[PDB]
Protein backbone atom coordinates (compact mmCIF):
# COMPACT_ATOMS: atom_id res chain seq x y z
CA UNK A 1 0.00 0.00 0.00
CA UNK A 2 1.02 3.57 -0.71
CA UNK A 3 1.60 6.26 1.93
CA UNK A 4 -1.70 8.12 2.18
CA UNK A 5 -1.79 11.57 0.59
CA UNK A 6 -0.47 14.07 3.11
CA UNK A 7 1.26 11.43 4.85
CA UNK A 8 5.03 11.93 4.66
CA UNK A 9 6.99 8.97 3.29
CA UNK A 10 9.18 6.75 5.46
CA UNK A 11 11.25 3.56 5.43
CA UNK A 12 8.59 2.11 7.74
CA UNK A 13 6.29 1.07 4.89
CA UNK A 14 8.58 2.18 2.20
CA UNK A 15 8.17 5.55 0.40
CA UNK A 16 5.82 5.56 -2.59
CA UNK A 17 3.05 8.11 -2.07
CA UNK A 18 -0.47 7.14 -3.20
CA UNK A 19 -1.85 8.00 -6.64
CA UNK A 20 -1.99 11.61 -7.79
CA UNK A 21 1.40 12.29 -6.23
CA UNK A 22 4.85 10.68 -6.23
CA UNK A 23 7.39 10.52 -3.40
CA UNK A 24 10.97 11.77 -3.64
CA UNK A 25 13.16 10.32 -0.88
CA UNK A 26 16.19 8.90 -2.68
CA UNK A 27 19.50 8.35 -0.87
CA UNK A 28 19.18 11.89 0.50
CA UNK A 29 18.09 12.35 4.16
CA UNK A 30 15.24 14.61 3.09
CA UNK A 31 12.12 12.91 1.72
CA UNK A 32 8.57 14.00 0.91
CA UNK A 33 5.68 13.57 -1.51
CA UNK A 34 5.20 15.52 -4.75
CA UNK A 35 1.83 16.00 -6.43
CA UNK A 36 1.64 16.42 -10.19
CA UNK A 37 1.12 19.84 -11.74
> Quick check: 11 and 23 in contact, CB under 8 A?
no
Ramachandran quadrant class, 22 (left: phi over 0; alpha: psi -120 to 50; beta: rest): beta
How many helices (H) and strands (E) in the chain?
0, 0
Q: Domain span at residue 7?
A: 1-37
Q: How many domains does the chain have?
A: 1
> Quick check: 17 and 1 in contact, CB under 8 A?
no
> Quick check: 11 and 26 in contact, CB under 8 A?
no
Of the chain, the end-to-end C-alpha distance in Å amounts to 23
Amino acid sequence: GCLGEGEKCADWSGPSCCDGFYCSCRSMPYCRCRNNS
